[PDB]
Ligand binder design. Structure first.
Ligand SMILES: CCCCCCCCCCCCC/C=C/[C@@H](O)[C@H](CO[C@@H]1O[C@H](COS(=O)(=O)O)[C@H](O)[C@H](OS(=O)(=O)O)[C@H]1O)NC(=O)CCCCCCCCCCC
Ligand SMILES: CCCCCCCCCCCCC/C=C/[C@@H](O)[C@H](CO[C@@H]1O[C@H](COS(=O)(=O)O)[C@H](O)[C@H](OS(=O)(=O)O)[C@H]1O)NC(=O)CCCCCCCCCCC
Lengths: 207, 207
């Protein structure tokens, strides 16, 4: 699945076309279902909601919103002082954190990071991803909820199986496809984070 | 708010009309927002989803589905062995548990139940409601998530204020209106639970 929906390579000008980006990331919310528990359903819903919101804005005028940069710059001009805590800019501000979670989690698994005492769990990998992508934007109650939910995570072997079901491939081949996916995905997420910095569109509030 | 949307009294035959029931309970999901935290948003969404699902079935043929009993009996006949774990029957099987939670929580608050050490919290009341209505249908991970989320609950004084905002009433008057609401609400929920028993439509699985 993951490598059937590669993100586009980054052009020299590092502009990310909105339409194709949304099409690519729209295949990611089911990722959380390969975890195999309803504890992950509200997570899938929040990420899906960001995508829907960005698409809704884009759809008002696909030309005006041709790139993600166009979204931020247009909304900055359209709105007053509520920006960047509004519209597709806010939706993408949160979406990028979820996309980063997925990135760091997968890279960690591919890099062979594991608890040597429990090498068939993915807790260490998910925890690292959470710390790096999301933790600092959650109050202590939400952080407590994450720690609890992590117990729902599947066995690594089963998780990787779920990502390749039907394909009849080895775990080694599965990890190769994940690595391929991570190239343009990681590059794209980095560019989005950098855009947020350049545009002064990043906010640090906790929920 | 609560007592502006009283449930209908129960007729002698204890049949509950589907249309008016759905109209009444459709005012309850915002209840969870008077708690004043996004930790409660996924809860509001699950309860809303049950309501939407029941309404969707009803809307296919309001006459056929005139009462909640009609829903169970019609679906039992329509479906095979997947019933009652299907359709509006399953949706109502879960909705009733949420409605019972709300009932027990409110009754507990009105009955003056409190932790004498922390009398302005509503933790004891919510915990009682959870134990009585939902706990046994949750695995340990979800139960852990509830304990954590309960820390998000507001102060009692603030919760009751939120329920009467704009009305300029005393807490004593607010509690009187809640008590009024609880009469036909409690009666109706009891009848639904009893119907589930009579129809052998209740399932005891955990999530
Ligand atoms: C009785 C049963 C037990 C109780 C159950 C309690 C449930 C606990 C629920 C915890 C929350 C679930 C996950 C959701 C988290 C979200 O609060 C945050 C912030 O969400 C943003 O809030 C914003 C609020 O706007 S503001 O008021 O103006 O500030 C916006 O709504 C924004 O959406 S937008 O499109 O409209 O722009 C929205 O994403 N979301 C996240 O943290 C992202 C979640 C991604 C997680 C990545 C994967 C990790 C999951 C663990 C996997 C091991
Ligand atoms: C990184 C961020 C941190 C991680 C966040 C993790 C999020 C944790 C989420 C925990 C779950 C949130 C609450 C939802 C609970 C639901 O799983 C259960 C069961 O739901 C049912 O499942 C069913 C599954 O069907 S089956 O597969 O065939 O079995 C159906 O989907 C059914 O819907 S239906 O309309 O389609 O029929 C549906 O209600 N719901 C509940 O427990 C009810 C929740 C009401 C709670 C009442 C208020 C208490 C809240 C605490 C307040 C102090």
């Amino acid at each position: 699945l993951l490598a059937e929906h590669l993100l586009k390579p980054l052009p020299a000008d590092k502009q990310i076309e909105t339409g194709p980006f949304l099409e690519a990331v729209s295949h990611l919310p089911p990722f959380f279902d390969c975890l195999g528990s309803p504890v992950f359903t509200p997570i899938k819903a929040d990420i899906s909601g960001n995508i829907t919101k960005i698409k809704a804005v884009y759809d008002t005028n696909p030309a005006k919103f041709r790139t993600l940069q166009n979204i931020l710059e247009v909304e900055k001009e359209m709105y007053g002082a509520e920006w960047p805590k509004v519209g597709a800019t806010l939706a993408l501000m949160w979406l990028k954190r979820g996309l980063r979670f997925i990135q760091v989690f997968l890279q960690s698994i591919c890099d062979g990071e594991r608890d040597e005492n429990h090498p068939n769990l993915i807790r260490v990998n998910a925890t690292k991803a959470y710390e790096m992508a999301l933790k600092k934007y959650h109050g202590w109650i939400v952080q407590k909820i994450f720690q609890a939910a992590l117990y729902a995570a599947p066995y690594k072997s089963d998780f990787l199986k779920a990502l390749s079901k039907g394909q009849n491939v080895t775990e080694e081949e599965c990890l190769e496809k994940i690595r391929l996916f991570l190239v343009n995905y990681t590059a794209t997420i980095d560019v989005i984070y950098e855009m947020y910095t350049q545009m002064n569109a990043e906010l640090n509030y906790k929920v």
